[PDB]
Structures are given as C-alpha cells and as structure tokens.
Write a protein that binds this ligand. Structure first.
Ligand SMILES: Nc1ncnc2c1ncn2[C@@H]1O[C@H](COP(=O)(O)OP(=O)(O)O)[C@@H](O)[C@H]1O
Ligand SMILES: CC(=O)/N=C1/NN(C(C)=O)[C@](C)(c2ccccc2)S1
Ligand SMILES: [Mg+2]
Length: 319
C-alpha cells in the first residue's frame, strides 16, 4: 500500500498578523486539494485528505487515525508522521493541549490530539469486546543524533540490530510502561511532559530541532490466537532546518525511495533506523503535513507540500 499523505492547514496566528502577512493557502477538503498563490498565479496539489483551518482535533482523529487504529488492532504495525515547519501544528496535531481552567477531564477534552485520543480509544475498543489485552507505551526523543527516554525518571539509549527483523532496531534500556487502565494513561503522559520541559532546559533550540517518537504496542489474545499491533506516532523536527542529520537523512531516504534508487541510506541516522520499516517496509504509514496559511511562509509551505506530495508514491507492503 502507498503511504497516505494528508495536509492540515492551521488558522492565522497573531505573529503572522503582525508581520502584515496575507493568506496564500486555500484548502478544499471536498476536492482533497491545496492551492498556494505563488507570487494570481497558483499551484495546486492533491492529497489523500486535506484539512483546513476550521478542522477540530476530533475530526483529524476520526478521519485519519481511527482507520489506522483498526489496522493496528488487527495485528499490524502502523506509523503516523507529522512533518512541517516549526509553528505550523505538528505537536498540536500529535499531542494536542489541555483546555484552560481545568474545564474538561482529559478523556473529554476537545483540544486533545492524536496520542491521548488513541490511548483512550484503545481501551474503549478492546474492553469487554471479548478481548484480553495489555498495552505498553514508550516515548523517546532524538536530538543531535542522541536518544533520550522521556519516560525514564532518572542517560542515553543504545541501538542494536533486531536479529529477527533486518528492517528493525532494538533500543536497549527504553522504558516500555504497561498502561493498566484509562486513568494510568494520563499519569504517564503527565510524566513525559515534565521530563520534556527539563529536557528543554539543557538543549539548544531543542523542541524545534528534536524528533519525538511515541510508540504503543498492543498484545491481544483470544481463543488461543494471538495478535500484536504497534503504532508509532512521530512528531518530527521542524522542516525549515549532527543537529540535523536525522531530518536530512529522512529527506535522502524519501528521495532514494521516490527515485527507486537501490541504496536507501536508512542506517545514516537514528530516526531512519527506527522507522526504516515505515519507509518502504512492512508498516502501514501516513504522513500529516502541517502548513501555515501566511504569505510569510510561502517558501517553507511550498517545500513542505512538494516533500509530502512525492511521498504518496512510496509503496509499503504490510505483513
Ligand atoms: N489547527 C490549529 N488550531 C489552533 N491552534 C493551533 C493549530 N495548530 C497549532 N496551533 C497552535 O500554534 C502554536 C504552534 O503549534 P505547534 O503544534 O506547537 O507547532 P509545531 O509543533 O509544528 O512547531 C501552538 O500554540 C498550537 O497550539
Ligand atoms: C506524548 C503526548 O502526547 N503527551 C501529552 N501530554 N498531555 C498532558 C500532560 O496534558 C497532552 C497534551 C494531553 C492533552 C489533552 C488530554 C490529555 C493529554 S498529550
Ligand atoms: Mg512541536
């Protein structure tokens, strides 16, 4: 199956209003098109889905992620990437935010993004639909070609080949935490958030240059036939950017794949080793390309759109 590629455009922000920018992006969800005025000259792209600035978190989840979670629960591996310019909505999309003033429970918060909703829906979907299951999660960051375990309450992780799968790696020392119930989900996410703000203190431009890999693995057993599904939820460093080796190598890998070049340089960065199987392997993969509507960003926005559109022709073969 081909990589699914969707675009999410966010509303104008006030920094763009202060820069005197005008709108140059038109999202057409019905036609699945994004049009960019390139000076009345225009460039249109077609994607698998297009989400405009009024799209709600829950819309993204139902339209993009629900199909993918169903595949995981069938026992496949899946990956969703968020790709795009700093400030355009990668983290808002993958993680979301809490609404102000303690107004919602985490499970009901309309600003939750893909990660919290996915973990909540795992428990809704598998609970007492006949199923015995366990769920574990891990969260690592990649910064400056170094691995950081956001769930380790203490360091630096070591990468080993997976002798069982050539397109795979094993991260020794990664905290893979069992999530026993919905209430545990929020405690674990809270714990990763605290670990990331202190990650913020000891880093240079850390969040915009770091990659974040959240992984959930579901062990499922029914009578006695077993299923193991994995989902990786990846928030990439900003696309405008050892500090950039992984982002740059991701660009070479995608290029190598789109040109059918026989040498794909997967092993030239930690990110591309981790998601080697997501890029031309046996994992089903979607990319959410995030963009700004503002004229200020024409060059980054065109770069993001070209990058993402080319990705549509990469074929994966799940299982
Ligand atoms: N679709 C959207 N609607 C409203 N606010 C958004 C949207 N996307 C991003 N934002 C806000 O814009 C700011 C930057 O988004 P963020 O997701 O942190 O960007 P990135 O991770 O790409 O740098 C944040 O305050 C975020 O809440
Ligand atoms: C890796 C990741 O996604 N981490 C998260 N931490 N959150 C905390 C601590 O509120 C997020 C923002 C959230 C938002 C709404 C509902 C529940 C969780 S998501
Ligand atoms: Mg971010």
């Amino acid at each position: 199956k081909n990589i699914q590629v969707v675009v999410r455009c966010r509303p104008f922000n006030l920094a763009e209003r202060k820069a005197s920018a005008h709108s140059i992006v038109e999202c057409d969800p019905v036609r699945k098109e994004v049009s960019v005025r390139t000076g009345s000259s225009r460039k249109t792209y077609t994607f698998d889905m297009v989400f405009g600035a009024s799209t709600k978190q829950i819309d993204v989840y139902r339209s993009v992620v629900c199909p993918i979670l169903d595949e995981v629960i069938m026992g496949y591996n899946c990956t969703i990437f968020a790709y795009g310019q700093t400030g355009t909505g990668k983290t808002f999309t993958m993680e979301g935010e809490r609404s102000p003033n303690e107004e919602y429970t985490w499970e009901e918060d309309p600003l939750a993004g893909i990660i919290p909703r996915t973990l909540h829906q795992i428990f809704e979907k598998l609970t007492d639909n006949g199923t015995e299951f366990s769920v574990k999660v891990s969260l690592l960051e990649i910064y400056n070609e170094e691995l950081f375990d956001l769930l380790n309450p203490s360091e630096r992780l070591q990468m080993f080949d997976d002798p069982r799968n050539k397109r795979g790696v094993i991260i020794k020392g990664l905290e893979e935490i069992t999530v026993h119930n919905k209430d545990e989900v929020y405690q674990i996410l809270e714990k990763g958030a605290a670990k990331r703000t202190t990650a913020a203190t000891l880093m240079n431009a850390y969040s915009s240059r770091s990659h974040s890999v959240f992984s959930v693995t579901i062990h499922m057993k029914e009578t006695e036939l077993v299923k193991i599904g994995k989902l990786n939820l990846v928030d990439l460093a900003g696309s405008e950017n050892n500090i950039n080796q992984s982002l740059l190598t991701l660009g070479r890998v995608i290029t190598a794949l789109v040109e059918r070049t026989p040498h794909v340089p997967y092993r030239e960065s930690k990110l591309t080793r981790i998601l080697q199987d997501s890029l031309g392997g046996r994992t089903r993969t979607s990319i959410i390309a995030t963009i700004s509507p503002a004229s200020l960003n024409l060059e980054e926005t065109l770069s993001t759109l070209e990058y993402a559109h080319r990705a549509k022709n990469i074929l994966n073969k799940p299982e």
